Amino acid sequence: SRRRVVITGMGMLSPLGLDVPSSWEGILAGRSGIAPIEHMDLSAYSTRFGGSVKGFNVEEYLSAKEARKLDLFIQYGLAASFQAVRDSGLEVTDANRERIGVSMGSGIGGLTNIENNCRSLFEQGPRRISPFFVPGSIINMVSGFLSIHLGLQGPNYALTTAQTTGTHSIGMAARNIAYGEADVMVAGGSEMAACGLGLGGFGAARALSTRNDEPTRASRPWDRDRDGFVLSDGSGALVLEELEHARARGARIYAELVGFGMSGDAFHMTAPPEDGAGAARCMKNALRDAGLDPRQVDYINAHGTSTPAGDIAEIAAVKSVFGEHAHALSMSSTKSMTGHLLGAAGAVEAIFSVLALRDQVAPPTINLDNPDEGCDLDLVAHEAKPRKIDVALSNSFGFGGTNGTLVFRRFA
Amino acid sequence: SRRRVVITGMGMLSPLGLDVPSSWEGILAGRSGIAPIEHMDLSAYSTRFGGSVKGFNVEEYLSAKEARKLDLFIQYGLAASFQAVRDSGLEVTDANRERIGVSMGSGIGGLTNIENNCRSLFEQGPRRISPFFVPGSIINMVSGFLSIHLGLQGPNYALTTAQTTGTHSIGMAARNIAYGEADVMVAGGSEMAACGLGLGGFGAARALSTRNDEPTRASRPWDRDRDGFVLSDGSGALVLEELEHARARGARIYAELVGFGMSGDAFHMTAPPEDGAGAARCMKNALRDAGLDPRQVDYINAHGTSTPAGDIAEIAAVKSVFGEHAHALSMSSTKSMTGHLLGAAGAVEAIFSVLALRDQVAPPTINLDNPDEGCDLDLVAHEAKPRKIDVALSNSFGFGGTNGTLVFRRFA
Ligand SMILES: Cc1cc2cc(C(=O)O)c(Cl)cc2[nH]1
Ligand SMILES: Cc1cc2cc(C(=O)O)c(Cl)cc2[nH]1
Ligand SMILES: Cc1cc2cc(C(=O)O)c(Cl)cc2[nH]1
């Protein structure tokens, strides 16, 4: 009844690479992108490391002058978006531009821009605030600037669901296409919260790993010595496309997006319920949306943020949804390597789930030296595992109990 | 198949009142809610007035202790949301809680809280950043906190499309219900951008009226002496409900939501095109979505922000869409009275459009003393106009060239 939705283009900035192939090579190699932060004085901070984008040149995408108008999170979102559109080979024309939209989100948006303009405001007064402060800092300006640059006149919006943003953005973009509002959507997320406010904010909540002595070992999902998440920056974008449209132009199809689930925990502002009941409802919703039996799932890209409560809740949710099959599927947290890109986490992890299908390899959970009590599933400890993957699930859970699941399948 | 969506509950904080009835009374009376700002010293600012929420008591909704953790935009969004849910008479149960979701958005979210924590960080150090900085400031936490307080386990997300947020939030929530992801959604927007960075930021862009001597006269959509928008605070929430679900429980139905349009201008970061081409595309999309002859439109709640370029572009768009019928419909800007609530604008204006249907009256455009060149439509200058309204359209246009239109009609 609804139209089928396929992935024809992907783009990324991550702590592992300035594009998808370099990032994916890092993932399959078990490489960490976590390092002491260099771009700011963290002397007063209990966490002094994170996943930075290393060597990003915005001038490959924008003039210096246009880039100066935009927070880093918008620059990162545009870079991933331009990559994804180029990767798709899509030609935007007068005939189709009304059928091509964009939904690129962020969890936290323009903290670095706000910090910089704050400094000017407090030291000199409001006369020193940039004229571009508002349009250069608001979360919908990845969608806005991408649409202006490429001439996209389809649905133009942005989601902000904290750490679930990238997953929800991709899922709702798939709905736009499936139910006929667009033929193509650029969807995903971007984040740059490695500023005083980001590290300070999460630090004040005591939510961050403080393993400053061994940053590459800090992100250790399901390991008994985990002590909170690692803050990371970057972006992921997918070109989502109606199947008939993709086939008509001879698009290379990476995978099909067959399922999208949402749920609210309705439990706590930041903490998940012990049994992951909302995450379980969300995964079941995604599987029902895809018309799939739980036993058809081969690979789960976990939320797996390396928090004591979250990692255990996620094991409980998977055990509830999949029963005995929980022991047959493979589940890994690529955040073991990338850290937590917050709003961009679901976008880069959708891409890793699609590449898991393409290459038939489950990425590793690195740092899983001593699995905690009840963490007895195949969590792909230490090393990439070649295996059969017909169906891959990507999970994101966020503040406010907001849950999202995407289900991808090999394209037949 | 596409299910019908009705409005069964509404809630509001505005510069005209602390609920819908008091706000609507102010609208039909031609009252201004614009006044010199009292909550901060604006002596260094070019604009020193706006639409404040006057006498808001968060303790009518939340404990003092919980409220201290939450930016005003979250307090305002929860107040509107609790009002809307109470107004709907809906009882949340184990049987329906997975089918009730929330999409309450904001254009900039917790700017006041971020500014205050900025000041703590720069003046005193990161040890003075609030532990509640992130959950108290990020845009998705209206949806989060509402779901926690009421036990809502359905789709839980937030849109952020600058000044189009409230319109998009309602439209996409309607799609969730229409296509079966939920039976009920609480949808709308909230904004509190009246801090140094908000007033300073819009001020630096020269986007604000500087009529400090006569604040109640500053917002004058389509008047030749207009000189930019008036910044306003508050919130709107609607309970959207599947028609058969509403009928089954004997719900009071205000109106049906029959049409939703989106488009991108793909033109400029902040400015609309002179001919309002994107706004015209958006309205035509919404009218086709509603299965309507454009001649069925009786009343348009305009974007009408009181900017020289914006107001004219909107006249051009309406003339392009409606042709001769442009002279039969009534169009007014309630922003003449409320100012521009930014992300909440579309939410409060959806409510005013629904009440225009209920009471068969077009709200006035106050301050329209001397209509500009080509502003020769029925703009309901000065005084409310009783008239036949079967179909009401609400328009929102925003930064990034984002456009949204909602189409409401009387329900028997
Ligand atoms: C289940 C479902 C269908 C759907 C359609 C649209 C649309 O664009 O028409 C949107 Cl936004 C969200 C949706 N969610
Ligand atoms: C099942 C589940 C795990 C989890 C972890 C986090 C986190 O702290 O990263 C959050 Cl927000 C929600 C979660 N829900
Ligand atoms: C047709 C149209 C009028 C308009 C006004 C504004 C504004 O500046 O308030 C914006 Cl962002 C977009 C607009 N699009």
In residues, how long is chain B? Answer: 412
What whole-number distance in Å separates Cα of residue B76 and Cα of residue B57?
10
Binary contact (A117, B197; C-beta < 8 A):
yes
What whole-number distance in Å separates Cα of residue B255 and Cα of residue B262?
21
Please name which of A311, A330, A325, A321 lies closest in space to residue A373, comparing C-alpha atoms.
A311
What whole-number distance in Å separates Cα of residue B16 and Cα of residue B349?
13
**What are the Cα distances from residue A222, in Å, to A298, A316, A331, A410?**
20, 12, 11, 28
Domain end (from B259, B278, B303): B259
What whole-number distance in Å separates Cα of residue B103 and Cα of residue B170?
8
In the block, which residue shows the tokens 């500009």? B372
In residues, how long is chain A? Answer: 412
Position B231, amino acid = L
Residues whose CB is less than 8 angstroms from the CB of residue B70 and which lie 6 or more positions away in sequence, other chains included: B62, B78, B132, B136, B141, B145
- Does A282 contact B at CB distance below 8 Å? no
Quick check: is B1 in a domain?
A: no
Is residue A234 within 8 A of residue A5, CB to CB? The reply is no
Is residue A258 within 8 A of residue A393, CB to CB? The reply is no
**What are the Cα distances from residue B365, in Å, to A262, B15, B211, B236, B350?**
41, 16, 18, 20, 16
Whether residue B287 sits in one domain with residue B375? yes
In the block, which residue shows the tokens 């649409």? A147
> Quick one: B176 exposed, middle or buried, by C-beta within 10 A (0-12, 13-18, 19+)?
buried
Q: How many CB atoms lie within 10 A of CB B316?
A: 18
Is residue B19 within 8 A of residue B12, CB to CB? The reply is yes
Whether residue B356 sits in one domain with residue B321? yes
Range list of β-strands (E), B76-202: 100-105, 156-157, 184-191
> Quick one: B38 exposed, middle or buried, by C-beta within 10 A (0-12, 13-18, 19+)?
exposed
Q: How many CB atoms lie within 10 A of CB B244?
A: 11
Binary contact (B44, A139; C-beta < 8 A):
no
DSSP A102-147: EEEE-SS--HHHHHHHHHHHHHH-GGGS-TTTTTTTSTTHHHHHHH
Ligand nearest to the CA of B318: 3
- Does A127 contact B at CB distance below 8 Å? yes
What whole-number distance in Å separates Cα of residue A185 and Cα of residue B218?
40
Domain end (from B198, B231, B259): B259
Please name which of B108, B189, B182, B183 lies closest in space to residue B146, comparing C-alpha atoms.
B189
Whether residue A88 sits in one domain with residue A35? yes
Whether residue A251 sits in one domain with residue A199? yes
DSSP H/E element including A321? helix A308-322
For β-strands A5-13 and A234-242, DSSP reports them as antiparallel
Question: CA-nearest residue of chain A to B401?
Answer: A144
Quick check: is B274 in a domain?
A: yes
What whole-number distance in Å separates Cα of residue A203 and Cα of residue B48?
36
Question: Which residues constitute the domain of residue A69?
Answer: 6-259
**What are the Cα distances from residue A255, in Å, to A322, A356, A411, B279, B337?**
23, 10, 5, 35, 52
Classify A59 as helix, strand or coil: helix
In the block, which residue shows the tokens 């909230």? B190
Binary contact (B118, A197; C-beta < 8 A):
yes
What whole-number distance in Å separates Cα of residue B292 and Cα of residue B20?
29
Is residue B303 within 8 A of residue B397, CB to CB? The reply is yes
User: What's the number of CA atoms in the CB half-sphere (13 Å) around residue B351?
Assistant: 33
Binary contact (A134, B399; C-beta < 8 A):
yes
Quick check: is B55 in a domain?
A: yes
Whether residue B331 sits in one domain with residue B280? yes
Whether residue B271 sits in one domain with residue B214? no
Classify A260 as helix, strand or coil: strand
Whether residue A173 sits in one domain with residue A248? yes
What whole-number distance in Å separates Cα of residue B196 and Cα of residue B42?
8
Position B105, amino acid = G
Pocket of ligand 1 (CB under 6 A): A 172, 175-176, 179, 181; B 172, 175-176, 179, 181
Contacts of A401 in chain B (CB under 8 A): 144, 147-148, 156
The tokens for B165 are: 């947020």
Whether residue A278 sits in one domain with residue A187? no
Whether residue B312 sits in one domain with residue B178? no
- Helix, strand, coil abundance in chain A, percent, nearest 5: 40, 20, 40
In the block, which residue shows the tokens 């809680």? B97
The tokens for B290 are: 């509603």
Residues whose CB is less than 8 angstroms from the CB of residue B372 and which lie 6 or more positions away in sequence, other chains included: B222, B223, B224, B226, B311, B312
Helices (H), B249-322: 277-289, 308-322
Task: Say how many CB pairs under 8 Å bridge A and B.
Answer: 290
What whole-number distance in Å separates Cα of residue B136 and Cα of residue B154?
22
What whole-number distance in Å separates Cα of residue A156 and Cα of residue B269?
13
3-state secondary structure B239-259: EEEEHHHHHHCCCCCCEEEEE
What whole-number distance in Å separates Cα of residue B322 and Cα of residue B329?
9
Quick check: is A1 in a domain?
A: no
CA B216 from centroid of its chain's CA atoms:
20
Give the resolution to one decimal, in Å. 1.8
Contacts of B164 in chain A (CB under 8 A): 157
Is residue B240 within 8 A of residue B87, CB to CB? The reply is no
CA A311 from centroid of its chain's CA atoms:
17
Helices (H), A125-241: 141-150, 165-178, 196-204
Domain end (from B235, B259, B283): B259
Pocket of ligand 3 (CB under 6 A): B 163, 229, 272, 276, 279, 303, 305, 307, 310, 313-314, 317, 397-399
- Does B40 contact A at CB distance below 8 Å? no
Ligand nearest to the CA of B231: 3
Binary contact (B144, A278; C-beta < 8 A):
no
What is the sign of the dihedral through the CA atoms of A230, A78, A347 and A404? Answer: positive
Quick check: is A329 in a domain?
A: yes
The tokens for B72 are: 């005003």
What whole-number distance in Å separates Cα of residue B328 and Cα of residue B184?
35
B364: left (phi over 0), alpha (psi -120 to 50) or beta: beta
Q: Residue A101: beta bridge partners?
A: A185
Q: How many domains does chain A have?
A: 2
The tokens for B19 are: 């609920």
The tokens for A212 are: 């400053």
> Quick one: B214 exposed, middle or buried, by C-beta within 10 A (0-12, 13-18, 19+)?
exposed
Whether residue B216 sits in one domain with residue B88? yes
